[PDB]
């Protein structure tokens with residue numbers, strides 16, 4: 117559990133404009149800029165050089181402080197790789213060029229339920245797991261609007277709060293007993309033991325099982 121996370125997902129805002137029935141959203145608003153600043157300071161103290169995204173289960177382009185937050189990543193963690201995951205409904209050409217200049221290296225746009233292109237990827241939405249490994253808690257930290265740290269993007273209900281960055285350094289949370297044993301337990305495939313993982317049907321995302329098939 118020594119290796120730092122390679123991706124951190126930050127819920128800079130919790131609302132999304134869509135109502136996708138397949139999404140946890142169906143069925144506060146924005147992250148305190150002070151809270152985002154202490155996260156930047158912590159990530160800066162680690163010389164963080166992995167990926168950073170701005171979407172948990174909300175639409176980042178709805179965040180009124182998005183430009184500020186993106187600009188701060190370039191100041192605090194210029195080695196990191198800022199990525200926007202967005203439904204695209206707010207992504208005008210102007211926002212795109214502005215966000216790119218501020219530091220975003222990639223936009224992953226997903227046309228969802230309803231209704232710079234080198235840096236734009238366009239997608240369109242369109243039991244026995246008890247022993248499966250999973251490497252997500254070894255690679256990914258999630259930070260919610262209120263600062264809670266989760267081991268996975270699946271934990272919408274925050275069953276596995278590892279700590280809170282408003283109260284503790286994210287490196288210390290990442291390396292605490294609870295997070296360390298969890299990622300070890302999931303690396304060994306003990307999904308059945310976790311209330312988060314035991315019913316999870318992730319088979320392709322950071323699993324040994326992923327080399328097979330298709």
Ligand code: SF4
Nearest residue numbers: 132134136139203228
């Ligand atoms: S656009 Fe994405 S985050 Fe928003 S409701 Fe749909 S699936 Fe959920």
Ligand code: SF4
Nearest residue numbers: 250268270313316318
């Ligand atoms: S098994 Fe599922 S819920 Fe558990 S850490 Fe992996 S992806 Fe997340």
